[PDB]
């Protein structure tokens, strides 16, 4: 029990992420690549390619103090050239924050959500979800309910959307590459489909696809016109349209076990025998490593527990436990990437 | 570019510490200790012995969910879920002897007031003379602390515990005090520092030197003698001086004045004792790097005037004050005792 290591070892748990979130906020990773592939610059250099830092002499040293920490975290590479300066360079998990040449996707939007003040405020009240009966960290921490806050609070809406959005562009691109069980299907229906996007994209790698979008009236009300897509409003708990194969990306984790039955029922009772409710979650591995498949589950099981804790991420066991108790012959799960599955529930 | 690799590496960065805070806030780490050496207690059982949660049907359902993350984190031991303490975890259990642990100090480092300031870190790179704490909170840190008690206690409990641990280290490794008859603790605080030392080396006469307003409240200690004043104008006379967590609070300019005054109130063969965490010349995923980075950040957020420093930089302050010798004395994971000899 060496306290003065257990310090620097637990003391950094809070620092690393808020140092990171400042690099992002200051668009460091971008400005670094606007210098070349496998490159290396001083904070002095990066504080020059920064607009709001004109007329703050300390800009360069203060920045060097942040980057040193990321550079020590591995979240950045670092090297010193001959009067000796610290020069900075990108990494694997650090290029994943350079916005792409074409479409602009990055984890920036995803990571600014996770590390967002609204969220952390909500984390700071986790304690409660154990202690109090039904308490919601989010609710305990803020005026009232999440949809209430988010209505009356534009920038919280921006960040929760922009995150789940870039993170979809990425969660999907690798649904493509692996899974190809989209072509012995002509018709597909997105239950809790959002405003299409999911299908919009699908019915464009598979143009021979009857793209249907099912969500709440107020959602589809806003929802734009994708060629491929026909939209449908309802309450998937009361009844789901008819369709061949159906799609449930990030619906089942928002919902309890009983409410996951009642949905999957209505999903079957409107599926032709031969079609399948496709389920796209991050799956909770049964033994939990430092394994990314283990953090890709745990991270959201937390965010759920903080903002909507009636939610839950599940083991592949726990998902066929559902597929079955609805009434589904198969339950044939396809590993995709680092914990992202397509559990298939067959009727 | 594996988007769903780095999605976990970075995603967890903010989940561990808030998750850990929740475990501390709920007692977990101790309660797993209160089941005998190298135990392995369970989510349901730990809830079992947790009074403030004795009427939450879902309690253990929710707890297991946090612990998992800690398990994966490696702060706890999987054992399949049957959780149990570790090297890391053990440092979170209030001791038999004094009830001390790292808790008080982490519960501090990760307190809302501090994170809230952290959220404005960008501002110290953008606006000149800007103070994250200040951007974030109404007032300046002292005004704020003056009027919010629970923040001000958390900063106390935090620093308190931390010193204890740092002193246990310094005492176990540093001879220096043995042939000392007088010790002046410049910036001494309430003299809890110089008292602990005089207790361990009683042929040393303790003098505690701080701001009047501080001294005005210090308790009475055997062989400690309180002296109020303003170390920037003059420091009292003493055979030797102690400077603990003082230099790292101030610009180079202000430091060498504090050091010129120390020299002027020293004999010849008198020495100043800098106790700081030294910032390595090469940073790395090691305790000696993070033990200097954590403060250097906390500084930027709560005191941009201050900075951690490198054995060479401290030395440069020494010479500029006019000391003739610097002896750097490594203690533990970056902790030094620096001697400036006059
Ligand atoms: C996490 S989002 C799904 C995101 C979307 N699949 C994507 O990948 O972009 C959950 C969706 O469930 C929808 N939803 C919630 N309750 C519903 C209900 N009763 N009927 C239909 N849709 C519902 C919401 O409107 C929301 O769009
Ligand atoms: N001009 C000045 N004169 C004397 N003491 C001062 C001062 N400016 C700051 N201080 C004192 O320096 C201390 C800062 S740091 C904490 C001191 C001590 N090493 C400890 O571990 O307990 C404060 O208590 C503060 O009042």
Domains present along chain B, CATH in parentheses: 1-92 (no CATH), 93-342 (3.40.50.150)
The experimental resolution of this structure, in angstroms, equals: 3.0
Name the one residue in this structure whose structure tokens are 């202690």. A131
Name the one residue in this structure whose structure tokens are 């009356």. A152
- Nearest Cα to Cα of residue A47 among A36, A33, A32: A32
Q: Where are the alpha helices (DSSP H) in B110-239?
A: 112-118, 132-136, 141-147, 149-173, 192-200, 212-215
- Strands A77-79 and A87-89, sheet pairing: antiparallel
**Are the Cβ atoms of B13 and A17 closer than 8 angstroms?**
yes
* CB atoms closer than 10 angstroms to residue A178: 14
- Residues that constitute the known binding site of B for S-adenosyl-L-methionine: 159, 163, 187, 210, 230-231, 244
Distance in Å from the first CA to the final CA of chain B: 57
* CB atoms closer than 10 angstroms to residue B175: 7
- Residue B92 CA, chain-centre distance (Å), reads 15
Q: Which residues of B touch A291 (CB under 8 A)?
A: 72
**Are the Cβ atoms of A47 and B125 closer than 8 angstroms?**
yes
Q: Which residues of B touch A9 (CB under 8 A)?
A: 88, 287, 290
**Are the Cβ atoms of B290 and A117 closer than 8 angstroms?**
no
- Strands B182-186 and A340-341, sheet pairing: unpaired
Q: Which atom of ligand 1 is nearest to the CA of A247?
A: 6
Distances A264 to A261, A270, A331, A342, B124 between C-alpha atoms, Å: 5, 10, 13, 15, 52
- Nearest Cα to Cα of residue B41 among B78, B72, B74, B83: B83
Per-residue tokens: A342? 């397509």
Q: Where are the alpha helices (DSSP H) in chain A?
A: 3-10, 15-25, 28-33, 43-46, 59-73, 92-95, 108-114, 117-123, 127-131, 137-141, 146-151, 154-177, 198-202, 217-220, 257-268, 292-306, 316-326
Rounded-to-integer distance, Cα B297 and Cα A69, Å: 9
Question: Residues B165, A4: contact at Cβ < 8 Å?
Answer: yes
Q: Which of A1, A2, A13, A129 is most worth mutating to test chain B (most B CB atoms within 10 A of its CB)?
A: A13
Q: Using what technique was this structure determined?
A: X-ray
Rounded-to-integer distance, Cα B146 and Cα A310, Å: 40
- Residues that constitute the known binding site of A for S-adenosyl-L-methionine: 164, 168, 192, 215, 235-236, 249
Rounded-to-integer distance, Cα A251 and Cα A279, Å: 9
**Are the Cβ atoms of B297 and A69 closer than 8 angstroms?**
yes
Query: Residue B245 region, left (φ>0) first, then alpha (ψ -120 to 50), else beta?
Result: left
DSSP classification of residue B235: P
Distances A88 to A68, A70, A94, A321 between C-alpha atoms, Å: 9, 10, 12, 50
Q: Which atom of ligand 2 is nearest to the CA of B244?
A: 19
* CB atoms closer than 10 angstroms to residue B251: 11
- Nearest Cα to Cα of residue A289 among A340, A324, A338, A238: A338
Return the biggest CA–CA distance within chain A. 75
Residues whose CB is less than 8 angstroms from the CB of residue B264 and which lie 6 or more positions away in sequence, other chains included: B234, B235
């Amino acid at each position: 029990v060496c306290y003065l290591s257990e310090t620097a070892n637990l003391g950094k748990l809070i620092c690393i992420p808020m140092a990171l979130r400042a690099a992002m906020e200051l668009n460091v990773f971008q400005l670094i690549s606007k210098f070349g592939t496998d490159a290396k610059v001083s904070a002095s250099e990066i504080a020059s390619k920064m607009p709001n830092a004109k007329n703050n002499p300390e800009a360069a040293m203060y920045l060097d103090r942040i980057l040193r920490l990321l550079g020590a975290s591995s979240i950045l590479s670092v090297s010193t050239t001959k009067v000796h300066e610290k020069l900075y360079g990108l990494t694997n998990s650090s290029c994943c924050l350079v916005p792409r040449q074409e479409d602009g996707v990055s984890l920036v939007e995803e990571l600014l959500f996770t590390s967002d003040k609204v969220v952390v405020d909500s984390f700071f009240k986790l304690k409660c979800v154990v202690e109090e009966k039904d308490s919601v960290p989010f609710e305990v921490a803020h005026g009232a309910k999440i949809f209430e806050y988010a209505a009356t609070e534009p920038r919280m809406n921006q960040v929760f959307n922009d995150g789940m959005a870039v993170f979809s562009i990425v969660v999907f691109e690798a649904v493509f590459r692996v899974y190809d069980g989209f072509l012995d299907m002509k018709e597909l229906l997105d239950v809790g489909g959002g405003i299409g996007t999911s299908v919009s994209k699908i019915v464009a790698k598979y143009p021979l696809i009857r793209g249907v979008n099912f969500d709440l009236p107020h959602v589809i009300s806003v929802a734009p016109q994708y060629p491929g897509v026909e939209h449908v409003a309802g309450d998937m708990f009361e009844e789901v349209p008819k369709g061949q194969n159906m799609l449930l990306k990030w619906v089942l984790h928002d919902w309890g076990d009983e409410r996951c039955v009642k949905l999957l029922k209505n999903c079957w009772n409107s599926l032709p025998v031969g079609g399948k409710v496709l389920i796209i979650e991050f799956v909770l591995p049964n033994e939990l490593g430092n394994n990314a498949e283990s953090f890709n589950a745990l991270i959201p099981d937390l965010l759920l527990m903080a903002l909507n804790p009636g939610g839950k991420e599940r083991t592949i066991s726990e998902y066929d436990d559902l597929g079955k108790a609805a009434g589904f012959i198969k339950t044939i799960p396809i590993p995709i990437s680092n914990g992202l599955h397509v559990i298939e529930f067959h009727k």
